[PDB]
Design a protein around this ligand. Structure first.
Ligand code: MG
Ligand code: MG
Ligand code: MG
Ligand code: MG
Ligand code: MG
Ligand code: MG
Ligand code: MG
Ligand code: MG
Ligand code: MG
Ligand code: MG
Ligand code: MG
Ligand code: MG
Ligand code: MG
Ligand code: MG
Ligand code: MG
Ligand code: MG
Ligand code: MG
Ligand code: MG
Ligand code: MG
Ligand code: MG
Ligand code: MG
Ligand code: MG
Ligand code: MG
Ligand code: MG
Ligand code: MG
Ligand code: MG
Ligand code: MG
Ligand code: MG
Ligand code: MG
Ligand code: MG
Ligand code: MG
Ligand code: MG
Ligand code: MG
Ligand code: MG
Ligand code: MG
Ligand code: MG
Ligand code: MG
Ligand code: MG
Ligand code: MG
Ligand code: MG
Ligand code: MG
Ligand code: MG
Ligand code: MG
Ligand code: MG
Ligand code: MG
Ligand code: MG
Ligand code: MG
Ligand code: MG
Ligand code: MG
Ligand code: MG
Ligand code: MG
Ligand code: MG
Ligand code: MG
Ligand code: MG
Ligand code: MG
Ligand code: MG
Ligand code: MG
Ligand code: MG
Ligand code: MG
Ligand code: MG
Ligand code: MG
Ligand code: MG
Ligand code: MG
Ligand code: MG
Ligand code: MG
Ligand code: MG
Ligand code: MG
Ligand code: MG
Ligand code: MG
Lengths: 126, 46, 95, 18, 62
RNA sequence: UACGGUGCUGAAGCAACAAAUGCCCUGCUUCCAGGAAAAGCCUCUAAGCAUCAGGUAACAUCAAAUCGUACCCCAAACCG
RNA sequence: CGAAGGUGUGCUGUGAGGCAUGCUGGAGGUAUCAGAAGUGCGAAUGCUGACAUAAGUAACGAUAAAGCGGGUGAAAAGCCCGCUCGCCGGAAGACCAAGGGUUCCUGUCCAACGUUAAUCGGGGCAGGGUGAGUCGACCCCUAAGGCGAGGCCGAAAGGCGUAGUCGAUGGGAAACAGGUUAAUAUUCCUGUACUUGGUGUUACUGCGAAGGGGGGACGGAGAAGGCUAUGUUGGCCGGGCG
RNA sequence: AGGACCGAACCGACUAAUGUUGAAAAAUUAGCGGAUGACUUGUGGCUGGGGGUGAAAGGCCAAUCAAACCGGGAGAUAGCU
RNA sequence: UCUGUUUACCAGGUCAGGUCCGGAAGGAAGCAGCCAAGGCAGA
């Protein structure tokens, strides 16, 4: 299936090619609903991302749900960073694992057609 | 078994429907009492 | 028909997979239109405002749902959807 | 291609708005 | 506005009425697609229409 | 082939017999308890109108609105 | 520098009570003497609310029935997929009217709802879905019946009814076969039709009604003659030699 | 031919058992009566309480009937508890 | 004691990536991978 080794590969392949002005322009469908400026700083987020993924042992990378409080302490200590960044990175891998399972079960055109952008009420951003 | 209320819209309306109340003196008095008691819906319509 | 009326009938293009597929396959567009608008009005209106030639217009009426917001029970206002068929040599402008 | 662009788009993109 | 409009004839009034409507329609078409940023636009135009008609009317009555 | 489907092609496509409560039948035969109405429809004229108006045929043309249309209906959606 | 209340304790009166203080509480209380009461609760098969008891008992709604592998998943007797097995089959299948009103389809969610569990649902939230000249209503026409200009009748309101106008469960123009959607189709699409009007053209020509006539127009029972729907067999066609 | 016979749909409701805080405020199971008619069933309409309607049981009139239900007179009246 | 393989952080060494100090020179703590090493085995 999908692992943080496969996310390691997706990430050292994506930190090579990627930019935030070539990625926020290839879509004008979610550059109208979300602010055109909310992309990221790609170099920093993918260098932190590759740092945090590299700090992992091979059994924590191949199986991402065995990572708990002590392991996040240690991933924060080896890459010299915050337990909160490690947290929200295990959370983005959680969502993209969710989405590659939803591309796996349903066809590429049914999981690209039923994808939804939302407003809590129809007024802009509110 | 066969219970009392067997619904039919037509019957419902020709009986207690608004115009059927606008038929008679006592219809119009029921409507008065109803507005005076500040009823949400006077008759059954829709 | 008068123009001050035509401008007031077409609310907004309705989007969907159904709509899309009709556009591609059947050369049809889908519109949220004034609830009271009639096939004649709609025909004339799209023919004028969008400068295209219409073949025929089929209309239906969406019944609003009934939703709960913070326990109160509301009802979305109903509306009229219209599938408008364009003659085959007609290309689609969006202004 | 198809799964390369559907990966890459939804990845950089849905990394962004959530 | 509304003085500037009081100073135009019945003819030019209806002309600007029409143009105002075209503008409003076009607007709500854009906003329909989500291709419109400025919402305040709507409420300007719509109000403006009123101005116009209310002038036409007082030219018709007196 | 995303294993969901999509694409192209595609044989033979008959005879007998059986047979309804369905169709011929708003028929037919018979009985007494003797079996709705009004429009469209076909025709007659009156008032009228007469190379006008109007009627019939063929060809062309335009029109045919408005609402219902999902789903449940021997039921977990209806009356209990 | 801690009121009312709440809650312990101490002291005191013959009693209804009083006084003091520990904790709680976090802004109000009130001597004295008067005045006025919605002034004192254990009962009323009293009223409202809360919580016990029986009791972790009876029950989990037809005795048509399940079993296994795999999937997902925090967790699978119930979900999904597969192989078996069992039940309905003049219904427990298919299509409508009545009535309901979004229960339909797709994502998504598992607190409450589901007499259990729930990853499931007619449950929650979001989105999507209902395409007509020929289906039905609308409309043309009347039945029973309703309403009823005038009119007759009546202490008053009102009662009856004419001319009329409404009223279907009945009469009145016409579309079928195939293809398609995650969810509509005689409506979309492909093909082939048909109907009644408006306008014109032509040819021809007595046209006209709220009036006359015909038609629409009609029971029960029975008989059995002609067919079809439809099915079986053969033939044909493709496959199978298990 | 027939308020003829035998028997399903349909209509009923004779006997038994079950059930009786029911699966259900009148049912289920097993049998039983009529089943071309004084039959049954749909949609609509009419009959209003000192009244209706009754192949007549004081039956039925929205699970209410020897005088329906709803509001009013009304805090009826209660030598009774 | 050779070879087969096991043990995230919290025994050791190398410590990539990344991160701290510095303008720069360079250091530094150290996660992963590897080797000790500790589990369990072929001899
Ligand atoms: Mg009924
Ligand atoms: Mg069409
Ligand atoms: Mg329609
Ligand atoms: Mg509203
Ligand atoms: Mg094929
Ligand atoms: Mg028969
Ligand atoms: Mg039959
Ligand atoms: Mg339909
Ligand atoms: Mg349907
Ligand atoms: Mg039935
Ligand atoms: Mg059924
Ligand atoms: Mg069924
Ligand atoms: Mg005190
Ligand atoms: Mg006080
Ligand atoms: Mg106190
Ligand atoms: Mg204190
Ligand atoms: Mg105190
Ligand atoms: Mg305190
Ligand atoms: Mg005082
Ligand atoms: Mg006090
Ligand atoms: Mg006193
Ligand atoms: Mg008292
Ligand atoms: Mg006592
Ligand atoms: Mg008691
Ligand atoms: Mg309370
Ligand atoms: Mg107990
Ligand atoms: Mg016991
Ligand atoms: Mg026991
Ligand atoms: Mg019991
Ligand atoms: Mg038990
Ligand atoms: Mg059960
Ligand atoms: Mg299993
Ligand atoms: Mg659970
Ligand atoms: Mg299993
Ligand atoms: Mg089971
Ligand atoms: Mg199965
Ligand atoms: Mg069987
Ligand atoms: Mg309905
Ligand atoms: Mg709902
Ligand atoms: Mg469903
Ligand atoms: Mg439960
Ligand atoms: Mg679902
Ligand atoms: Mg639901
Ligand atoms: Mg018809
Ligand atoms: Mg009459
Ligand atoms: Mg009068
Ligand atoms: Mg009358
Ligand atoms: Mg009529
Ligand atoms: Mg009818
Ligand atoms: Mg008819
Ligand atoms: Mg369907
Ligand atoms: Mg006649
Ligand atoms: Mg007839
Ligand atoms: Mg006869
Ligand atoms: Mg045949
Ligand atoms: Mg062969
Ligand atoms: Mg007998
Ligand atoms: Mg019955
Ligand atoms: Mg029986
Ligand atoms: Mg019997
Ligand atoms: Mg018999
Ligand atoms: Mg009858
Ligand atoms: Mg009496
Ligand atoms: Mg009385
Ligand atoms: Mg009787
Ligand atoms: Mg009763
Ligand atoms: Mg009485
Ligand atoms: Mg009393
Ligand atoms: Mg009195």
């Amino acid at each position: 299936g999908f692992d943080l080794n496969d996310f390691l590969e997706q990430l050292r392949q994506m930190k090579n090619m990627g930019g935030x002005x070539x990625x926020x322009x290839x879509x004008x469908x979610x550059x109208x609903x979300x602010x055109x400026x909310x992309x990221x700083x790609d170099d920093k987020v993918l260098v932190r991302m590759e740092a945090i993924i590299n700090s992992m042992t091979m059994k924590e990378r191949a199986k991402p749900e065995i990572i708990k409080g002590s392991r996040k302490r240690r991933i924060a200590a080896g890459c010299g960073m915050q337990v909160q960044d490690v947290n929200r990175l295990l959370k983005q891998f959680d969502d993209m694992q969710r989405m590659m399972k939803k591309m796996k079960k349903g066809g590429x055109x049914x999981x690209x057609x039923x994808x939804x952008x939302x407003x809590x009420x129809x007024x802009x951003x509110x | 078994m066969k219970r009392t209320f067997q619904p039919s819209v037509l019957k419902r309306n020709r009986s207690h429907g608004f115009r059927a109340r606008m038929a008679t003196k006592n219809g119009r008095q029921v409507l008065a009492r109803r507005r005076a008691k500040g009823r949400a819906r006077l008759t059954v319509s829709k | 028909i008068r123009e001050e009326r035509l401008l007031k009938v077409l609310r907004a293009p309705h989007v969907s997979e159904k709509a899309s597929t009709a556009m591609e396959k059947s050369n049809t567009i889908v519109l949220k239109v004034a609830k009271d608008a009639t096939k004649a009005e709609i025909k004339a209106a799209v023919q004028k405002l969008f400068e295209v030639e219409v073949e025929v217009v089929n209309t239906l009426v969406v019944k609003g749902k009934v939703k709960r917001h913070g326990q109160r029970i509301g009802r979305r206002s109903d509306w009229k959807k219209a599938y408008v068929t364009l003659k085959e040599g007609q290309n689609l402008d969006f202004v | 291609m198809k799964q390369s662009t559907l990966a890459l788009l939804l990845l950089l993109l849905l990394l962004t708005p959530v | 506005k509304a003085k500037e409009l009081r100073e135009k004839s019945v003819e030019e009034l209806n002309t600007e009425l029409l143009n105002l409507l075209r503008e409003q329609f076009n607007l709500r078409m854009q906003a329909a697609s989500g291709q419109l940023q400025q919402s305040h636009l709507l409420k300007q135009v719509r109000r403006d229409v009123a101005r116009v008609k209310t002038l036409l009317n007082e030219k018709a009555g007196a």
